């Protein structure tokens, strides 16, 4: 069993997804307690041209909202902006509100996306946060408001709400405080992503996954100090390695130290030629050490 991207069960989050519409806009929202959060552009008269959010909010009429889980329609008693998200007070407390907290995802970390189409959970899949505050997911018209979440030791964290797609196809969203990841604006403007910085942690993890799968043609037995690696990293768009403590177990199971993989990285970054690793044609940084420790040993 090779390396495949996975998602944590979505059962806890499914009961919180609702359909939110205002006029001709329809997207997904998150119903927790007596609140419903969703992208604010849902109240925009026309999400196709530049939006004056102050005005759209000034002209909003609570009764024009339509919030429903399934057959249960919720009454909106108040609406306010909280960053790029709309926070709606509803007349009913979600009886299936799971125990939860909120937090932001840092570059290189993974989480799950529960993509829904107009209030209906359609799919779930794993993603990894890129350095520019974007993720490579798959969202089609109507999946805005999709929810990102992580389960870390019994704790459910809500961490992402989908807002838009950049011209280059990258997906942009916000945390629940309403701050857009990567600082992008929720406007149909023309904003660029920029050069992404590969996560060294994750790539080293990727290679361990390869070794564990029987591939070692890229093994060099020659090692590169963490210090030398970091200097190289800065000029080649890769993050500086924290230390090697994160892979202690992986280095033991494989017999290859992190320093050896670091040397492999530098050389592999010049190209795989006609060779592949875990069937990929280049370095992959979408899998974290923790993610890889599972998928190979599943001990969490």
């Amino acid at each position: 069993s090779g390396l495949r991207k996975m998602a944590q069960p979505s059962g806890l989050v499914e009961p919180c997804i609702v359909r939110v519409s205002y006029g001709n806009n329809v997207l997904n929202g998150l119903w927790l307690g007596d609140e419903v959060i969703c992208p604010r552009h849902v109240i925009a008269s026309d999400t196709t041209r530049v939006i004056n959010y102050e005005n759209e909010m000034s002209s909003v009429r609570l009764h024009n909202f339509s919030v429903s889980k399934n057959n249960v329609f919720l009454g909106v008693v108040s609406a306010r902006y909280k960053g790029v998200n709309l926070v709606l007070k509803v007349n009913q407390v979600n009886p299936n509100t799971p125990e939860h907290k909120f937090k932001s995802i840092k570059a290189g970390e993974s989480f799950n996306i529960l993509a829904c189409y107009e209030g209906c959970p359609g799919s779930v899949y794993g993603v990894n946060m890129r350095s520019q505050g974007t993720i490579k997911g798959s969202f089609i018209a109507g999946t805005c408001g999709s929810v990102g979440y992580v389960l870390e030791n019994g704790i459910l964290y809500f961490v992402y709400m989908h807002h838009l797609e950049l011209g280059n196809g990258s997906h942009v969203g916000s945390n629940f405080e309403g701050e857009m990841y990567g600082g992008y604006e929720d406007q149909p403007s023309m904003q660029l992503e920029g050069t992404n910085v590969m996560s060294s942690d994750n790539v080293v993890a990727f290679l361990y996954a390869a070794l564990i799968n029987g591939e070692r043609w890229f093994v060099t037995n020659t090692s590169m100090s963490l210090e030398s690696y970091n200097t190289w990293a800065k000029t080649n768009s890769f993050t500086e390695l924290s230390s090697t403590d994160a892979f202690s177990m992986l280095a033991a199971k494989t017999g290859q130290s992190v320093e050896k993989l670091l040397d492999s990285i530098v050389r592999l970054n010049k190209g795989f030629g006609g060779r592949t690793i875990l069937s990929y044609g280049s370095l992959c940084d979408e899998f974290t050490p923790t993610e890889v420790i599972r998928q190979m040993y599943g001990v969490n």
Binding site: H41, T143, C144, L164, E165, N168, P188, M190, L192
Partner: peptide, 6 residues
């Protein structure tokens, strides 16, 4: 090219 507010 750029953005679409989904």
């Amino acid at each position: 090219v750029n953005s679409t507010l989904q």
